[PDB]
Amino acid sequence: VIKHNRFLSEYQSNFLGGGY
Numbered sequence: 001v002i003k004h005n006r007f008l009s010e011y012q013s014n015f016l017g018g019g020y
Contacts, residue, residue: 004010
């Protein structure tokens with residue numbers, strides 16, 4: 001898994017809205 005090479009931050013944490 002890539003995980004955006006510690007740069008994007010998981011799409012900015014789902015742009016402050018993502019239930020997981």
